[PDB]
Amino acid sequence: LNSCSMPLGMESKAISDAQITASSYFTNMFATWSPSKARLHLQGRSNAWRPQVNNPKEWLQVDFQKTMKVTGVTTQGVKSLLTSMYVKEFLISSSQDGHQWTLFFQNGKVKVFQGNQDSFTPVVNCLDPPLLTRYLRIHPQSWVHQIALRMEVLGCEAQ
């Protein structure tokens, strides 16, 4: 049990909207599931990030504005009407400049994190080893009904 595992700012909004971006997002005159909606326990009609299309090539990115020691992530889905929407598996990549990205590996291969199994229960996935990075990306790989994501990043200061 280490101290380097505190919520960095997705739920609290310590991490501003501008720091959260994505490959794309689902929006129309009825709803806007923008990147900055990807916050753990956020309430609302379109309270989650949803890519414009459900494909494994989409991603959600967080910029801490400085190097942080990331020790884990927490993911959650959402439910709209009678439809549960959540990511079951995902990958993680990181970068220092925001151009060169590297996937997180575990036991000789790309780590496919086991995510959520329902609409509202958060699932914590620890990173062993931790990552020292300024930029972090989540890559949905499998999902139930639709790719929808609310999250949090766990860690502490680096440098």
Swiss-Prot record:
Impact of changing R134G on the protein? In HEMA; moderate
Quick one: which gene encodes this? F8
Q: What is the effect of changing I92T?
A: In HEMA; severe
- Effect on the protein of changing R134C: In HEMA; severe/moderate; may cause reduced phospholipid binding
Q: What is the effect of changing R39L?
A: In HEMA; moderate
Coiled-coil annotation: which residues?
none
Q: Please describe, based on the UniProt annotation, the reported consequence of changing R39Q.
A: In HEMA; severe/moderate
- The chain's disulfide connectivity reads C4-C156
Task: Please give the annotated consequence of changing G155C.
Answer: In HEMA; moderate
Name of the protein in its database record: Factor VIIIa light chain
Q: What is the native source organism of this protein?
A: Homo sapiens (Human)
Q: What is the effect of changing R134L?
A: In HEMA; mild
Indicate the impact reported for I20N: In HEMA; moderate
Ranges for domain F5/8 type C come to: 4-156
- So which domain of life are we looking at? Eukaryota
Membrane-crossing residues? none
